[PDB]
Amino acid sequence: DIGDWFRSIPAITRYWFAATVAVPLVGKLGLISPAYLFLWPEAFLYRFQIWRPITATFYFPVGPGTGFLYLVNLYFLYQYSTRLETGAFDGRPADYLFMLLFNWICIVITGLAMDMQLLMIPLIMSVLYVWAQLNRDMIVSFWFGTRFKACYLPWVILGFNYIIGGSVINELIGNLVGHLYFFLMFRYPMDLGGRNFLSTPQFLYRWLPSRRHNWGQGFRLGD
Amino acid sequence: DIGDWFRSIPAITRYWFAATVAVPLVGKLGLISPAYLFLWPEAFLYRFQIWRPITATFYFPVGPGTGFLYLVNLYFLYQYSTRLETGAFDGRPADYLFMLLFNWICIVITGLAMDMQLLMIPLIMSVLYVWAQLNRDMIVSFWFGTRFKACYLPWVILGFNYIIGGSVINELIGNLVGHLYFFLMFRYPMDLGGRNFLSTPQFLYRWLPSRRHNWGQGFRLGD
Amino acid sequence: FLVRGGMRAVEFKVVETDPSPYCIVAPDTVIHCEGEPIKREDEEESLNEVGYDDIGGCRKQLAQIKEMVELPLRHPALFKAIGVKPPRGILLYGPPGTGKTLIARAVANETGAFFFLINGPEIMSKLAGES
Amino acid sequence: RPNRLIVDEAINEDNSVVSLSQPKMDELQLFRGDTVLLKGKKRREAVCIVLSDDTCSDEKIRMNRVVRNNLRVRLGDVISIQPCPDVKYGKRIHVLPIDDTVEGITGNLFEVYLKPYFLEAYRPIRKGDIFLVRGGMRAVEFKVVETDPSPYCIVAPDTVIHCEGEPIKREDEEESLNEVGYDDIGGCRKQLAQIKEMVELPLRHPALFKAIGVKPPRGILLYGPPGTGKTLIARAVANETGAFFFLINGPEIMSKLAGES
């Protein structure tokens, strides 16, 4: 099961899932230095410190008092990423490659301006929130939940994650940055103007192409 | 959903909910100084302390050791405040709004004689004690509860808050004044005498009206 | 008051009037029939449930049930003072569908009582010895 | 409006015919061979051809199962018979089958299913529809997945049919044409005219029985020898009126466990 299932989930999901799952495995056993991945903001303000530009963006020390919350977001992500590849993003992997980059640079600049350290939950819910507004208008009712009406998902999920734990900074910016990009990528061009002045370069398409309908070979004679 | 629902709340209650949620928001993320709201009672004894007469009375530094209590009472406040405002109180908003003023002044003086700083719960449970006793004789049985008989809520609710937490004094002082005010405003006039010598001035009704019946589009059809 | 409709029986309520309270309707009067309808309040019994004017073909038998049950249910204290034994079981028998659970529903709704039906099939099939 | 009529089932198949009374087309500025646009619920359109009928009434239109399914309507509903005889010839068509009908068939589907179907018919087709072809041994349904020009096109003697490709997965919004209906019962003409007169009203329009305040039926007991088609009357009635047929069985209730039955 471990073999074929890992290669059958979409490549984007299969690498992203393993990107942030195997790293805590090293932390719990503790071979590499757990103190080596902090992303000090004040150090970045004084020196460039090319040592840790992205390194501390995947390491989370899940453990005794830092579990639960980290574990559950893996459940929804695994339950919900596979949906949002199929949420019209299957035909646009390059587009899906892009706003992942845009979101990652958007959270980190706010992650560097103010002094939080672990930017781990934000990248999970930001794409999840973006999935909600972009794939609204369905009714969902799980076994241990209520019969809440549709199109309430982005706000209802905003409560459970917030009240468990804290650190109001990451929840607010993560949803807001998804909101502004939601208006920018989708609503801004058809509202007043300001079209897609962030188009993905052909080099990204050259790396991985999209999917197109092929017509094949035709055959039909007179009558 | 946030737009209409927030405006759907009655203004007095919608003012109530905002004060109970916005003030916690500032404290937790550390915008205002947490120590800036403590209500030093001994200072009130010596000097007038005009700087913070009421500001520290809304201060609640929620923490992940008692936050579960902070959620249940607000959950209790949210759904029952709807019940009490429509329970024989729709046509008298001024009478209800002023009755809150007596429930607030009574605790704040008692909070000066003794030395408690966290003055949030006692007012919440006081009106809840008031709400149950003036809206007695109703059978209630929630999903995770038993089939206990009616007119038992103010006594049993005094047990649940007592075990979870402590500070035996606030529970006692909360129950008594609502019990005395029930005797004063409602039972004293019809027991022996001494009617409403605190009546609502016209300045209140100038601020806001109470209610007025509507006739409708009349018909004149005879033979 | 209850108005007989085309296929139903709609009952209204005089909720407000002027000059209060005695105001006979006159050929030049104003009727305000618009507004959200009032919730059915408690205390009073509805004017649509069964009564003595809702049975026919049983004028004799409903005379026997009525004389035997009107006294113990209307004057509970008098039987205590005189100290005579009252009736304690009545057995209505007949074909099904002839209106037996309607004779026992009209008697409770008119003399004033606490009709508490228990059923046959539901008692018999609850659980083992818990029935 | 002289457009909204009631629908009823057909007899002579022919997935592209509707039956209308003579005066209806006479007063609706219609002529023979005029293609018409039919529009119904969910903003769906189906293009058909009209022809005369001997015993068709003015307000009733007779049409078969396949046309009804495309419009997403049921028996006794209302439809728009908006006419428009202007369709430009299609250039190249792409017709692909549904997955759960071509199990273990393969071969060239074009020359044994589609070739005798479009031959000398000039069938007018619209994008997104479904049609059923009676094969040599099965009944294979196809789905027009692309057309040029989109979406209105009439199949012409000179087009390009591209029947190559993997079958489309069955969607969620369909009737699954290969299922039971009123035309799949024979020898029960009288009885199926009683179970249909006493059940359509409580199930099709429920709200009426609340206002009128009368007693609906609450139980029907069909009896007869085994194998005569009793569970097929209940499955046919549920599939056409629109309901939630939920079968509970005899033997597997009696043999679950102790008191858990």
Ligand SMILES: Nc1ncnc2c1ncn2[C@@H]1O[C@H](COP(=O)(O)OP(=O)(O)O)[C@@H](O)[C@H]1O
């Ligand atoms: N005067 C009457 N005599 C007999 N039946 C009546 C009379 N009036 C109404 N009914 C009908 O009888 C029904 C009640 O009878 P039912 O409940 O079957 O008693 P039982 O179950 O004991 O036969 C009512 O639905 C009503 O329609």
Ligand SMILES: Nc1ncnc2c1ncn2[C@@H]1O[C@H](COP(=O)(O)OP(=O)(O)O)[C@@H](O)[C@H]1O
């Ligand atoms: N018009 C028809 N009348 C009766 N039976 C039919 C008709 N058409 C088909 N059948 C067959 O009758 C069978 C009835 O299904 P089944 O449940 O086995 O019998 P029953 O419905 O009597 O329990 C179906 O398998 C079907 O093949």
